[PDB]
Design a protein around this ligand. Structure first.
Ligand SMILES: CCCCCCCCCCCCCCCCCC(=O)OC[C@H](COP(=O)([O-])OCC(O)COP(=O)([O-])OC[C@@H](COC(=O)CCCCCCCCCCCCCCCCC)OC(=O)CCCCCCCCCCCCCCCCC)OC(=O)CCCCCCCCCCCCCCCCC
Ligand SMILES: CCCCCCCCCCCCCCCCCC(=O)OC[C@H](COP(=O)([O-])OCC(O)COP(=O)([O-])OC[C@@H](COC(=O)CCCCCCCCCCCCCCCCC)OC(=O)CCCCCCCCCCCCCCCCC)OC(=O)CCCCCCCCCCCCCCCCC
Ligand SMILES: CCCCCCCCCCCCCCCCCC(=O)OC[C@H](COP(=O)([O-])OCC(O)COP(=O)([O-])OC[C@@H](COC(=O)CCCCCCCCCCCCCCCCC)OC(=O)CCCCCCCCCCCCCCCCC)OC(=O)CCCCCCCCCCCCCCCCC
Ligand SMILES: CCCCCCCCCCCCCCCCCC(=O)OC[C@H](COP(=O)([O-])OCC[N+](C)(C)C)OC(=O)CCCCCCCCCCCCCCCCC
Ligand SMILES: CCCCCCCCCCCCCCCCCC(=O)OC[C@H](COP(=O)([O-])OCC[N+](C)(C)C)OC(=O)CCCCCCCCCCCCCCCCC
Ligand SMILES: CCCCCCCCCCCCCCCCCC(=O)OC[C@H](COP(=O)([O-])OCC[N+](C)(C)C)OC(=O)CCCCCCCCCCCCCCCCC
Ligand SMILES: CCCCCCCCCCCCO[C@@H]1O[C@H](CO)[C@@H](O[C@H]2O[C@H](CO)[C@@H](O)[C@H](O)[C@H]2O)[C@H](O)[C@H]1O
Ligand SMILES: CCCCCCCCCCCCO[C@@H]1O[C@H](CO)[C@@H](O[C@H]2O[C@H](CO)[C@@H](O)[C@H](O)[C@H]2O)[C@H](O)[C@H]1O
Lengths: 117, 52, 122, 82, 89, 37, 149
């Protein structure tokens, strides 16, 4: 026969076949535990990603709401004309800053919601 | 009328209508992805979901 | 040094022989019996092997199911039959009337059947 | 595939879709318990059984709250005291 | 599909092909920024032979001699009989 | 809007060419010119 | 050409299910032993057990008044000390005596130990579920104290 010369070398012991049935050096429960640990530890990336996404999504809301509250405090407190003349430019700067934050958020969101497939 | 006061119901009032003039636009617009595509690479999803 | 390292190699190879015997046993006992037939194999070939075979195609994220739809750009004279043309002429614009009707119906249902909430009575 | 912006959905799926078999099993178990309760009710009971209630301990020597019945040592002309 | 005048143009076709290949590579290939290469303890044939060039040579010479044949019929995964014989030799 | 822009460009770039009766990838299906030889 | 004469849609369903199961077995066979067993049996099993226990049984947060009443968990492993606020799942037939024995490990408990919820003492021959339903509805926080008075 063609392969009898090789198949004659395949003669195992009782202990050998028991060890094979049990799968000593082929199941590796330590490897399974390592995989489980790594897989559970890999859940931190989801939290990081959601944090980044929420921050980039609320950035314009913050620029529009909290700085707006500050501007509103200033408006409520100021009465004269010189200070108002000077504060109009701060308001315009806040407009430009809001648009800048919106551009930044658009960029980061198109980066975070881009899928290859 | 003890157990009959939470049964007087009134319906909502929102109307979901908004004209969609596309003749005004000539460029595409960005769109969100809401869910991961599980129809492709289904078997590896738990293993590659955490990457980017 | 020399003797100890050579004995280390010899015992390494003894362990290798033991591993090989248990490997043979595991295979010929469990895996040759549990091996799938091949009828339910994976109905595809890896893209690398296809590329080596010269068989890979990349395109057409979409498709055209019917030959009537496949051969339109090649006919050059009757891309659409007469009946198909007459049917197409009915969709030159979107129907804002149908949009309005369906939206009003859906809003009515959603508001007065699905989104009812209680209100106090004095 | 996926992306950082899909972390919410990825986490929700990974943690919820494996629970759907257990949810269906819970629903089936509830159905079977209701079936058994209704079969027992049809068979007959000394004191009534509340179907949609968690636990029904009432018997000839126990109240509907797990306590012994008061005034249950003797017998009554009209039969059961309940 | 893009909103260009001619999506069936050679430029578009070649761009789509290159994007296809780049995506598949970034997804499957073993790199410093791996997507799919993760939790690897038992490697497939291609990666195994790419990482262990010693085994590719041995597994290949044994195939050509044990079965007089061409490299074009090199099996995806060798039999345990062949592996055991190699270990004995 | 994407479709609108695509068609709006197709108009200008195809409707007045005299060379694009159809798409070039399907010119094999056109009849043959009796003037060439 | 959809469908064939003499064959039934139920036979088609059976064939499809057979195909799916064979493909699943093939894919499980040709997979890593390090990941497949875990991801297919151990995580599903644990998730199933947890969800079933939570959605079927009813639990109670147990506290103890004084440290001298704490049990002796020095021998048993994975819990070498008592911690108040412990979630304990019980059966609908459980009594206060059974709960006390489960807490103190079937060993001699202190004297005059009693259970309370929201300030209301339970009798030892009382069903925990019904006693909670009566005294602390939807607030199952139980307290073990010593009633000398
Ligand atoms: C009781 C039983 C159970 C309930 C069933 C009730 C009855 C329904 C039975 C089933 C359907 C009918 C069956 C018999 C049909 C027989 C007649 C026939 O054969 O042809 C149909 C018949 C004639 O067909 P035809 O011969 O080909 O000619 C058609 C005309 O030429 C016209 O063609 P057209 O190209 O001009 O199309 C017109 C289109 C015009 O094109 C458009 O649709 C553009 C506008 C789209 C708006 C955005 C779409 C969002 C879609 C969300 C859908 C889910 C919403 C959740 C549902 C509750 C909503 C409250 O307008 C529409 O008709 C679509 C209206 C969509 C609903 C509007 C929802 C509100 C939108 C809100 C937007 C504004 C947001 C801001 C709000 C703030 C305002 C201040 O016309 C129809 O009935 C059209 C069907 C409409 C279906 C909706 C359109 C598809 C959209 C798919 C959305 C995803 C749904 C997923 C489905 C579920 C998952 C699988
Ligand atoms: C410019 C436009 C011009 C417009 C002109 C308008 C003027 C024209 C006249 C029509 C005016 C519109 C009328 C709208 C409805 C009334 C207003 C309203 O909505 O009040 C809210 C109010 C809400 O009830 P609620 O108790 O306060 O709380 C609701 C919660 O959902 C309760 O919560 P829950 O947890 O207890 O859930 C219980 C729920 C449970 O529900 C479920 O679980 C599933 C629901 C069924 C799903 C399907 C399952 C399949 C089994 C049913 C099979 C049905 C198909 C037949 C199959 C045959 C083969 C076996 O039960 C139901 O809600 C039952 C709903 C009954 C639906 C069946 C009635 C027939 C529908 C078709 C009517 C077509 C009218 C077209 C009018 C023309 C418009 C152009 O409505 C009702 O009280 C019930 C309506 C009962 C029907 C009254 C119909 C007479 C009034 C209309 C006069 C014209 C009659 C024409 C009849 C034509 C032959 C059918
Ligand atoms: C208690 C211990 C529990 C532990 C588990 C114990 C064992 C239990 C069984 C295992 C259960 C887990 C199932 C995992 C399978 C998916 C994940 C996976 O790892 O698969 C990898 C595994 C290996 O895949 P691979 O090695 O990567 O590549 C080979 C291809 O899969 C080879 O592909 P192919 O060439 O052979 O055929 C193409 C294949 C494609 O499979 C795929 O490649 C990916 C499939 C997509 C998966 C996710 C799709 C989600 C889509 C969203 C749904 C939206 C619906 C919206 C509807 C709106 C309309 C109103 O076709 C399919 O099998 C998919 C059919 C179902 C898709 C349904 C989507 C809607 C379309 C409806 C079509 C019409 C109905 C079918 C009619 C058929 C004629 C009767 O996949 C498969 O073996 C076949 C796909 C799985 C088919 C489902 C098998 C039955 C599952 C039964 C679940 C019931 C569980 C509840 C038990 C009761 C508990 C109380
Ligand atoms: C992948 C997707 C990426 C998505 C990126 C998303 C990031 C940007 C999101 C910002 C959205 C902010 C819009 C809501 C705030 C305005 C509310 C409003 O309309 O007030 C009523 C306004 C002002 O009304 P009014 O002040 O005259 O009086 C009534 C006001 N109320 C009712 C509030 C009391 O209504 C209008 O009449 C406005 C008409 C003029 C047009 C104004 C729109 C331009 C200004 C906002 C630009 C923001 C987008 C910038 C994007 C830049 C990208 C490069
Ligand atoms: C109920 C809510 C459903 C809503 C969401 C789903 C979408 C709604 C549309 C219906 C969904 C099902 C579409 C099935 C389409 C397949 C038709 C088909 O011919 O397939 C080929 C099969 C196989 O055919 P065949 O191979 O035997 O013979 C024909 C051979 N060819 C095709 C070559 C000609 O045909 C069928 O036998 C019919 C199968 C569909 C009927 C079963 C529905 C499947 C959904 C249930 C899944 C669970 C199955 C186990 C059920 C056990 C019941 C006790
Ligand atoms: C509205 C809801 C919409 C969402 C869709 C909801 C429905 C669909 C959701 C599906 C998404 C989740 C799918 C994830 C699947 C991951 C599971 C998995 O693949 O397993 C990991 C293993 C991992 O294999 P692997 O480790 O070799 O490789 C995995 C990927 N890499 C290479 C990157 C590591 O996958 C398999 O190999 C087997 C998968 C098929 C088997 C599925 C389980 C059933 C097995 C039953 C057969 C039992 C036979 C026992 C015989 C014993 C003797 C030999
Ligand atoms: C012109 C005819 C058109 C045909 C339309 C037919 C559509 C019929 C579908 C009705 C389905 C409504 O389904 C039902 O919605 C109502 C809300 O309003 C819900 O109502 C629920 O909340 C309300 C308010 O708290 C309470 O009364 C109560 O807790 C409960 O009834 C029900 O839990 C749900 O079962
Ligand atoms: C292949 C089809 C599978 C479909 C799913 C079928 C459900 C499989 C799981 C059934 C578990 C049966 O095991 C049984 O579960 C119930 C609920 O936990 C337990 O019962 C427990 O809740 C019920 C309800 O109060 C009472 O019996 C009692 O309060 C308590 O003992 C039993 O002590 C346990 O013996």
């Amino acid at each position: 026969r063609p392969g009898q010369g090789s198949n004659a070398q395949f003669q195992t012991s009782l202990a050998d076949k028991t060890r094979g049935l049990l799968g000593v050096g082929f199941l590796r429960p330590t490897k399974m535990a390592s995989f489980a640990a790594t897989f559970l530890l890999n859940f931190r990336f989801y939290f990081m990603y959601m944090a980044r996404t929420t921050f980039q999504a609320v950035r314009p809301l913050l620029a529009f709401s909290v700085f707006g509250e500050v501007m509103k405090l200033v408006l409520a407190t100021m009465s004269s004309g010189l200070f108002s003349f000077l504060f109009s430019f701060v308001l315009a700067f806040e407009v430009f800053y809001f648009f800048l934050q919106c551009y930044i958020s658009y960029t980061f969101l198109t980066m975070f919601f881009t899928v290859l497939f | 009328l003890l157990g009959h006061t939470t049964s007087v119901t009134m319906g909502n009032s929102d109307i979901f209508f908004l004209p969609k003039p596309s003749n005004l636009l000539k460029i595409a617009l960005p769109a969100f992805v809401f869910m991961p595509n599980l129809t492709i690479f289904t078997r590896a999803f738990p293993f590659y979901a955490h990457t980017s | 040094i020399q003797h100890w390292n050579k004995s280390y190699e010899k015992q390494v190879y003894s362990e290798s022989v033991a591993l090989n015997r248990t490997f043979q046993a595991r295979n010929q006992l469990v895996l040759d019996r549990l091996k799938p037939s091949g009828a339910y194999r994976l109905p595809a070939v890896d893209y690398k092997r296809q590329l080596s075979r010269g068989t890979l195609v990349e395109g057409a994220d979409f498709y055209l199911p019917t030959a009537q739809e496949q051969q339109r750009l090649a006919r050059h004279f009757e891309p659409y039959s007469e009946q198909e043309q007459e049917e197409r002429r009915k969709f030159r614009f979107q129907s804002i009337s149908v949009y309005l009707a369906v939206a009003l119906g859906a809003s009515f249902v959603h508001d007065y059947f699905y989104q009812r909430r209680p209100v106090a009575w004095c | 595939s996926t992306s950082p912006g899909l972390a919410f959905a990825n986490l929700t799926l990974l943690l919820d879709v494996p629970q759907l078999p257990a949810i269906w099993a819970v629903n089936a178990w509830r159905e079977l318990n209701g079936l058994f309760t209704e079969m027992k009710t049809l068979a007959g009971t000394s004191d009534l059984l509340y179907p949609s209630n968690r636990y029904n301990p009432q018997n000839e020597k126990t109240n509907r709250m797990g306590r012994p019945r008061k005034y249950n040592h003797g017998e009554w002309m009209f039969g059961n005291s309940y | 599909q893009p909103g260009v005048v001619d999506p069936e143009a050679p430029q578009e076709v070649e761009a789509f092909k290159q994007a296809w290949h780049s995506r598949m590579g970034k997804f499957n290939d073993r790199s410093d920024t791996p997507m799919l290469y993760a939790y690897m303890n038992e490697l497939p044939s291609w990666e195994y032979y790419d990482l262990h060039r010693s085994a590719f040579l041995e597994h290949m010479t044994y195939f050509l001699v044990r079965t007089g044949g061409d490299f074009r019929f090199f099996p995806e995964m060798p039999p345990w009989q062949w592996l055991a014989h190699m270990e004995n030799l | 809007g994407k479709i609108h822009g695509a068609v709006w460009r197709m108009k200008h770039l195809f409707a007045t060419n005299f060379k694009m009766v159809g798409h070039p990838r399907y010119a094999y299906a056109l009849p043959k010119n009796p003037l060439l030889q | 050409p959809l469908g064939v004469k003499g064959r039934s849609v139920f036979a088609g369903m059976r064939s499809f299910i057979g195909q799916r199961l064979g493909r699943l077995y093939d894919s499980f066979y040709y997979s890593q032993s390090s990941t497949k067993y875990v991801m297919v049996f151990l995580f599903p099993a644990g998730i199933f057990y947890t969800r079933f226990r939570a959605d079927t049984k009813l639990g109670y947060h147990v506290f103890i008044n004084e440290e001298k009443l704490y049990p002796d968990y020095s021998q048993n492993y994975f819990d070498t000390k008592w911690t108040n606020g412990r979630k304990v799942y019980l059966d609908d037939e459980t009594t206060v005596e059974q709960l006390k024995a489960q807490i103190y490990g079937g060993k001699a408990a202190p004297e005059n130990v009693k259970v309370a919820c929201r300030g209301r003492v339970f009798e030892d021959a009382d069903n925990v579920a019904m006693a909670v339903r009566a005294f602390c509805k939807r607030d199952p926080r139980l307290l073990l104290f010593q009633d000398n008075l």
